[model samples]
Target: SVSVDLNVDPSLQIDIPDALSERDKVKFTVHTKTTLPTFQSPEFSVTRQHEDFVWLHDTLTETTDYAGLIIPPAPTKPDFDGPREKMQKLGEGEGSMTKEEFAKMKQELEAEYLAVFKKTVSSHEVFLQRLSSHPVLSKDRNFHVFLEYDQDLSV
Candidate 1:
């Protein structure tokens, strides 16, 4: 049996939608201890769903030696609130607002989310590169990757 360790400490903080105009950016970090099987490189690619968790996509590439790096999207102020407001707006509009206006608003919101996601993803990607390059983590093929609380948030 083979095992790979992965971890992120201080929790992966992401702001979930609570309201459109009102939001606290529900920031929470993520910490997970999991094992992953080593796989080939070509078959390894990563995509996101909620844009947080990473999953191996070997089936898609059909490579037994493939491994992937999943990275979560960055948290945005509106990512956690925009969708909620949009839904409420759609409900309140009740087919009143012009289709153009609704569509425009949606586009704007989507752009905002994607922008934040991309920025966060980039930062995380850098972190991953650095993490992977670390002499300790890089040298040990079986050691669990770890990210300690590099920065602390004051409550």
Candidate 2:
């Protein structure tokens, strides 16, 4: 797994507001991208909490073929850290695991993480396109978008 570098360059993700209904309620779709970490695509879904903030619902996720094999991090450890226990348990030699097993495992995990990020970008894009089709929201291009990480995960 690739470690998240806190010292890496800052990344700026943009969120778009959803179209309003006849009741004047503002909805939002999650679509945004950032070039800061090189290049990535992510899809997003959102729930409005207030005018200034919106709860992030879900981003698109890639199905990890090796999802079951990945050792989830312990509750006591930081998320940015990798699977500390599993890593420690592995033999200290390069020949412990077969080359094919290691390569396939790495490929599967990478695909899963990429799928998650790509979905977030796609969600926001879809919402923006739908919102633009409406006459009112299209006129105001400055509608603010924000992510609420603290919000409940379930819809």
Candidate 3:
């Protein structure tokens, strides 16, 4: 799709290729694609936690230099406790449920968890791609580091 705002840098692209739902947190696999020489590689993937995403947003928001830019907001945190607890309760009462019904219900509930995960992933991808598309934000060194560095960001 063509961008209607500012022209995005043609050489750069970003997305979350994969993510993992760990207890109380989700891990993001952020992948970058670029033909720009600024990055060490033309393509790469980075492991990121929620805090890392916020850290990038915070860093960008902190700069008076970039304050004029519309800083892309951070992705909101994921919550699984509500439905998850109900899921736990479902299994707890498993002996009472019809075998087929309980199994089917369990599968549906688990898929909801993945649905939420995908929503979270998509939100973050939008945020990253927003930055990537912005003429000024795309040039930011901090944004570059977020895409380039694969290790756990020492926040």
Candidate 4:
């Protein structure tokens, strides 16, 4: 994981009907500003539902990869040995890492990555909170959240 600092600017546009029962469409958008270069905007459709609704902007929720990354439940431990064996086999055939006497890279990679991942997740949560608190973006509007990550990480 790479550490990246991103800046997001939230904006909204909406068209509320004069009559609550009118069948009018709402147009709203949240602008995301980032320092990363060469980013493409992603889009999705919003469905219009006709029903009694309450906006739950008071409580903000966020999803993270932490749950998925957690070590598997008790009995079974991680199986890094399989990947290690593959790396060794590749090294034997390609003679790429064959000259290295020491191969202690996993810990180093996690050390460099774990902090960045945590920070990024925290930043994302804050962004979501900001969006929810915004007056126009929160209530029954066509909310769109756009993200622009580093090109390498975009995929």
- Note the Cα lDDT for every prediction shown: 0.38, 0.37, 0.87, 0.31
Superior candidate under TM-score, 3 versus 4: 3
**Which prediction has the highest lDDT against the true structure?**
3
Question: For residues 52-100, what per-residue lDDT tens digits would candidate 1 score against the true structure?
Answer: 3121111212333323533222323224355566657766885888889
Deviation (Å) of 3 in candidate 2: 47
Cα lDDT tens digits for candidate 3, 1-155: 88677756568889998888868588889999898888999999998888888889999999899866788789888777776987988989899989999999899988887787888898889999999889998989998888888778965
Compute the lDDT of residue 27 as modeled in candidate 1.
27
Every model: Cα RMSD to truth = 14.5, 18.5, 3.3, 21.0
lDDT of 4 by residue, 1-155 (tens): 99999746533222211211112221222234322232344322222211111122212222232333222111111123444555555556544444343244544444444444434333333444455455543431222322222212112
For model 3, give the 10-residue run with minimal summed lDDT.
1-10
Decoy 3 TM-score against native:
0.90
| Between candidates 1 and 2, the lDDT winner | 1
Name the runs in model 2 displaced over 4 angstroms: 1-96, 144-155
Ranking by lDDT: 3, 1, 2, 4
lDDT digits (tens) for residues 1-155 of candidate 2: 89784745324344554433222233434444444322233434445422322221111112243234322211121121233333334434337789887666656655654454344434444454443334443323233233323243335
TM-score winner among the candidates? 3
Runs in model 1 lying further than 4 Å from the true structure: 1-43, 46-79, 142-155
For residue 107, give model 3's deviation from the true position in Å. 0.8
